[PDB]
Design a protein around this ligand. Structure first.
Ligand SMILES: *[C@@H]1O[C@H](CO)[C@@H](O[C@@H]2O[C@H](CO)[C@@H](O)[C@H](O)[C@H]2NC(C)=O)[C@H](O)[C@H]1NC(C)=O
Ligand SMILES: *[C@@H]1O[C@H](CO)[C@@H](O[C@@H]2O[C@H](CO)[C@@H](O)[C@H](O)[C@H]2NC(C)=O)[C@H](O)[C@H]1NC(C)=O
Ligand SMILES: *[C@@H]1O[C@H](CO)[C@@H](O[C@@H]2O[C@H](CO)[C@@H](O)[C@H](O)[C@H]2NC(C)=O)[C@H](O)[C@H]1NC(C)=O
Ligand SMILES: *[C@@H]1O[C@H](CO)[C@@H](O)[C@H](O)[C@H]1NC(C)=O
Ligand SMILES: *[C@@H]1O[C@H](CO)[C@@H](O)[C@H](O)[C@H]1NC(C)=O
Ligand SMILES: *[C@@H]1O[C@H](CO)[C@@H](O)[C@H](O)[C@H]1NC(C)=O
Ligand SMILES: *[C@@H]1O[C@H](CO)[C@@H](O)[C@H](O)[C@H]1NC(C)=O
Ligand SMILES: *[C@@H]1O[C@H](CO)[C@@H](O)[C@H](O)[C@H]1NC(C)=O
Ligand SMILES: *[C@@H]1O[C@H](CO)[C@@H](O)[C@H](O)[C@H]1NC(C)=O
Ligand SMILES: *[C@@H]1O[C@H](CO)[C@@H](O)[C@H](O)[C@H]1NC(C)=O
Ligand SMILES: *[C@@H]1O[C@H](CO)[C@@H](O)[C@H](O)[C@H]1NC(C)=O
Ligand SMILES: *[C@@H]1O[C@H](CO)[C@@H](O)[C@H](O)[C@H]1NC(C)=O
Lengths: 177, 323, 423, 48, 48
């Protein structure tokens, strides 16, 4: 009613003279205008949020589908490989394919190997041991290889490194020939 | 990260205990339910905001007893036997926040509570958030970035730092030949941060503005009840005691319209602020994922320089990152 | 009837889904009524105002003063009949439950036609040069015919009015001068000749006149309402002061519903009521002591329901009430018998949020189902079927085997596919 | 007009007594306050 | 990056130079201060 005698315009008009009817009709007009203005304001507030979500889904389309992403937990949990889009009512769905390591193993490790007063650091990988032998392996998969002068670069002296151990570097060329 | 959750009793704010006003409010047509739905949505969103930033990993790793990390010292950020750290205590003390009982008040809080304006507690207490942040700290300082992927893999700390120096483009031997100097620099930097926090000057104005804004809005609501809005008085008892119900209806309708407008303005501005808080929470969740769980190559994302690592701390209504 | 009925009414549906819900009041209804009025038994003089043998002229009105009386006006019904009675600022049906302040009574005699000019916002010779009323006038105007007392067979010429004045009178202002009005130029000097008039003229009241000419006695009553210590009241009877309950208090014509407690506020001698930041009354002088009114309802109430499709059992949370203080807080003993069960029970647990009644406390920590807050959740589970309240668990616990010379290398991998939905 | 006799305050004041004028001026005040509040709300929505 | 900063004089927009309107606006209850605080916050944000 919004303070008027009724909420129906026909009852107000049928029972009252135009000068009397003006006040009630003005009350109704004010109320209904307020209702429309509340609806519009909340629609704008929701449109802002939908626009934020759309911008996010466009960045994800550009970076997870067209490229391989190195941002963490952007294209799912794991190491990102690729993604595929699908369309859904009013929205989009992403299928993210990721790589998850498993089946861990405990090894003993060292910062560097000291051969003849020279420290030796891996070029890519880490020095590991099975308790009797020393190998060099890549970080995310177990693939032991014999330490050679092509796996490890040489720099500095043994004394500076805190945890350096003693072992041998193969130096392929000279022993083969 | 979050803001305060509130609830409003529409009939107690507008009418009080007046039966006549309540009948007139029923006849008028009540949109109180819409206001309540908006406020309930806001509150649920605030809990979701808190959850996203901190509850990312659900394995509660524990602090390592040995605490041998090659000269790097984390005592100021690891918990101490509400199990918060030294720096977290300092942060919780720099912010000045704003069970109340009927016997207790028979103060602004009870002036709000007598008019239908209540404040709801968050779902996660501060102890839980501190447990989350300590789990993240333990996981990072023991397993580096591996725990983020899915399974923690232990690695000696100096090896992790060597792989981070390779990350920014400096070779391993630069770390292994300067290990003690780098440890000393890190310890001195942590010391400077602690000294800066223990000073009177406050850097946490961003977190204080939230509290001030909430208190200001709730107090403006209470001050706005003295407006006549064109009626003979702003007190319902004076209107009712001195006038007949047919005469009283027009004045009470004026008051009802005014107070409904006040409630609707409060609700709209609360929604507008909730949007901004949600933006900030999303930013802090991206920073938790990329600066704490991983090494970031984006420029000036995790501070100024070449990023090495970051550590989180919890603060009232927010989070702090040490880059 | 019930907390669940409160929830159903608040949500506007016959079915309530699983969830904790905020509720409105509905529970408490006031039933009593106290009255406090001053000790005044001296009836007001309705014989020495209305029945006065001689009335004033309109140019010099009486302006009498009244105080310390009860204002019971039905004592006039038998004796006098009023042709005009209209009130401004107050309804004529409330005049018997109010106490008036600063009461004044003005009296005069006009002709029948000019009675209509005694009203706010009028024009004419009486409103302009004789008697004027403020725009914001609170009071009442009474007028009655007196052609029996004020008319003589030869004519009555003792009532006078002012016909000429340089400018309009202001409200409640009087003018009894008798200078000579100067119509044009050429000053008068008291000659009273041409274009120089004596300003006062005399009504001529004969018994055989028209109703418009016939004399009409007029009385105007001026007062103030609910502003200061009053002294003129109304025929009512004071009642015992029922304390510490939801009642209707009606103190000195100010009505409402509330609770009364003693106060240490000190009032200046010209003050009786006090208003707070929200402008509502909080302190009322009663004995001359100052008391304090407090609302009927206080705090919030929540209802936890596992859903109406499953069961009609519910739990109730009081957010601002330490347990054992709940019955006084929710004004128990006036609630229906069903609603009292929740006030006191065996299943009472004090949480940080408030007091929870209707749920059993376990010592195990599961994942959250219905958030109660401050670390507490609630769930519908068997034991038979009940509502339990527990503390949420953050997650599983483990540790990392850390050593300065130890590493862990993965040997196998897994290809995982996950879905993300975005609007 | 917002339901008042005119949209000019001088016409309302010049032709009517203060007690009569209060109702029309109150109508105008309410309307113009609503206009200002709509402007402010949309400005906040755009600032975001 | 930014937008225009504005300020509003509530009494000059609603009442003008009318003393009677100003008195009625005082009695009515003024929330002009809240509007001004919102606009000032907007302006500071734009400079930031
Ligand atoms: C660690 O790995 C090395 C290399 O695989 C192992 O050495 C080999 O052991 C087998 C055992 O039958 C011999 O047949 C090979 O000739 C060995 N290789 C060399 C180069 O000597 C070693 O046994 C492993 N240790 C443990 C504890 O598993
Ligand atoms: C890590 O830092 C803490 C904080 O300074 C060290 O603990 C303090 O060391 C000082 C050394 O003078 C003592 O006087 C304090 O009593 C120690 N405790 C506290 C609470 O301040 C801690 O020793 C450091 N860890 C090291 C050096 O390995
Ligand atoms: C109060 O007294 C003053 C002075 O007698 C009145 O002012 C005079 O008003 C007349 C009417 O316009 C003028 O012609 C005179 O010149 C005024 N006198 C002066 C000294 O300026 C005034 O009107 C009186 N107030 C009322 C309400 O009658
Ligand atoms: C590594 O050793 C620790 C104890 O020394 C053990 O708890 C852990 O399970 C081992 N790692 C694996 C992958 O078994
Ligand atoms: C590892 O710690 C032990 C003590 O627990 C110590 O004796 C040993 O030298 C350390 N190794 C390195 C490489 O620092
Ligand atoms: C490596 O060899 C040198 C020379 O034989 C010796 O001094 C040093 O102690 C050895 N390192 C270890 C770890 O035994
Ligand atoms: C509630 O009552 C208990 C019992 O006296 C008391 O110890 C406690 O401090 C009170 N308040 C709270 C918040 O528990
Ligand atoms: C009014 O006065 C007349 C004349 O003295 C007297 O007869 C009459 O009783 C009086 N009535 C009242 C109510 O005083
Ligand atoms: C009512 O007034 C008339 C008028 O004289 C009088 O005769 C009558 O007695 C009055 N009523 C009572 C109950 O006295
Ligand atoms: C009024 O009446 C009450 C009745 O108990 C009495 O106690 C009081 O002294 C009287 N006077 C005043 C001024 O209250
Ligand atoms: C639950 O724990 C509390 C605290 O130790 C204890 O008092 C209570 O008896 C326990 N109840 C059960 C059923 O284990
Ligand atoms: C890796 O896992 C797959 C499936 O679980 C299994 O068939 C395969 O043998 C595993 N590889 C190793 C080296 O254990």
């Amino acid at each position: 009613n919004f303070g008027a005698i009724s909420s129906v315009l026909n009852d107000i008009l049928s029972r009252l003279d135009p000068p009397e009817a003006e006040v009630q009709i003005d009350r109704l007009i004010t109320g209904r205008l307020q209702s429309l203005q509340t609806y519009v304001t909340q629609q704008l507030i929701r449109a802002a949020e939908i626009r934020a979500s759309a911008n996010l889904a466009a960045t994800k389309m550009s970076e997870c589908v067209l490229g391989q992403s190195k941002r963490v937990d952007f294209c799912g949990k794991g190491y990102h490989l690729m993604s595929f889009p699908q369309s859904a009512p009013h929205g989009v769905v992403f299928l993210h394919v990721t790589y998850v390591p498993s089946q861990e193993k405990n090894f003993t490790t060292t910062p560097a190997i000291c051969h003849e007063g020279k420290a030796h650091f891996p070029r890519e990988g880490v020095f590991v041991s099975n308790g009797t032998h020393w190998f060099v392996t890549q970080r995310n998969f177990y693939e032991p290889q014999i330490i050679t002068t092509d796996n490890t670069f040489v720099s500095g002296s043994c004394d500076v490194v805190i945890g350096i151990v003693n072992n041998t570097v193969y130096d392929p060329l000279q022993p083969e020939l | 990260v979050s803001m305060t959750k509130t609830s409003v009793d529409c009939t107690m704010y507008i009418c009080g205990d007046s039966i006549e006003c309540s009948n007139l409010l029923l006849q008028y047509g009540s949109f109180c339910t819409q206001l309540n739905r908006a406020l309930t949505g806001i509150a649920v969103e605030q809990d979701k905001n808190t959850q996203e930033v901190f509850a990312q990993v659900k394995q509660i790793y524990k602090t390592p007893p040995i605490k041998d990390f090659g000269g790097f010292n984390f005592s100021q950020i690891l918990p101490d036997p509400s199990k918060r750290s030294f720096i977290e205590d300092l942060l919780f003390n720099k912010v000045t926040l704003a069970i109340k009982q009927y016997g207790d008040c028979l103060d602004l809080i009870c002036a709000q509570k007598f008019n239908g304006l209540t404040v709801l507690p968050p779902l996660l207490t501060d102890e839980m958030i501190a447990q989350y942040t300590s789990a993240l700290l333990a996981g990072t300082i023991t397993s580096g970035w591996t725990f983020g992927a899915g399974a923690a893999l232990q690695i000696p700390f100096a090896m992790q730092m060597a792989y981070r120096f390779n990350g920014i483009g400096v070779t391993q031997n630069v770390l292994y030949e300067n290990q003690k100097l780098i440890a000393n620099q890190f310890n001195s930097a942590i010391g400077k941060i602690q000294d800066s926090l223990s000073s009177t000057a406050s850097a946490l104005g961003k977190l204080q503005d939230v509290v001030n804004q909430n208190a200001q809005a709730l107090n403006t609501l209470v001050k706005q009840l003295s407006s006549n809005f064109g009626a003979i008085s702003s007190v319902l008892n004076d209107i009712l005691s001195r006038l007949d119900p047919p005469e009283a209806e027009v004045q009470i309708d004026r008051l009802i319209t005014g107070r409904l407008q006040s409630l609707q303005t409060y609700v709209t501005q609360q929604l507008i602020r909730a949007a901004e808080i949600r933006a900030s929470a999303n930013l802090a969740a991206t920073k938790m994922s990329e600066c704490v769980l991983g090494q970031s190559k984006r420029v000036d994302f995790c501070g100024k320089g070449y990023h090495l690592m970051s550590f989180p701390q919890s603060a009232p209504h927010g989070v702090v990152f040490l880059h | 009837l019930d907390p669940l009925s409160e929830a159903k009414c608040t949500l506007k549906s016959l079915t309530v889904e699983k969830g904790i819900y905020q509720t409105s009041n509905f529970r408490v209804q006031p039933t009593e009524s106290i009255v406090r009025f001053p000790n005044i038994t001296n009836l007001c003089p309705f014989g020495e105002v209305f029945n006065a043998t001689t009335f004033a002229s309109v140019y010099a009105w009486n302006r009498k003063r009244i105080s310390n009386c009860v204002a019971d006006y039905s004592v006039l019904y038998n004796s006098t009949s009023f042709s005009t009675f209209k009130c401004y600022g107050v309804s004529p049906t409330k005049l018997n439950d109010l106490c008036f302040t600063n009461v004044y009574a003005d009296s005069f005699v006009v002709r029948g036609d000019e009675v209509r000019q005694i009203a706010p916002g009028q024009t004419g010779r009486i409103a302009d040069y004789n008697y004027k009323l403020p725009d914001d006038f609170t009071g009442c105007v009474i007028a009655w015919n007196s052609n029996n007392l004020d008319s003589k067979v030869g004519g009555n010429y003792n009532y006078l009015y002012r016909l000429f004045r340089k400018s309009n009178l202001k409200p409640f202002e009087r003018d009894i001068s008798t200078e000579i009005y100067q119509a044009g130029s050429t000053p008068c000097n008291g000659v009273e000749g041409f274009n120089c008039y004596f300003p006062l003229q005399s009504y001529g009241f004969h018994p055989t006149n028209g109703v418009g000419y016939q004399p009409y006695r007029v009385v105007v009553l001026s007062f103030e309402l609910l502003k200061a210590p009053a002294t003129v009241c109304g025929p009512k009877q004071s009642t015992n002061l029922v304390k510490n309950k939801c009642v209707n208090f009606n103190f000195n014509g100010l009505t409402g519903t509330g609770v009364l407690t003693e106060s240490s506020k000190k009032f200046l001698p010209f003050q009786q009521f006090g208003r707070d930041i929200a402008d509502t009354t909080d302190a009322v002088r009663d004995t001359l002591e100052i008391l304090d009114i407090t609302p009927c309802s206080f705090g919030g109430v929540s209802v936890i329901t596992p859903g109406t499709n499953t069961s009609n059992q519910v739990a109730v949370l009081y957010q601002d009430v330490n347990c054992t203080e709940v019955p006084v807080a929710i004004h128990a003993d006036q609630l229906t018998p069903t609603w009292r069960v929740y006030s006191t029970g065996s299943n009472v647990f004090q949480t940080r949020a408030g007091c929870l009644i209707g749920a059993e406390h376990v010592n195990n920590t599961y994942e959250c189902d219905i958030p109660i807050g401050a670390g507490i959740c609630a769930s519908y589970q068997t034991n038979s079927q009940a509502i339990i309240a527990y503390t949420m668990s953050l997650g599983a616990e483990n540790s990392v085997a850390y050593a300065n010379n130890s590493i862990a290398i993965p040997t196998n991998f897994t290809i995982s596919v996950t879905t993300e939905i975005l609007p």
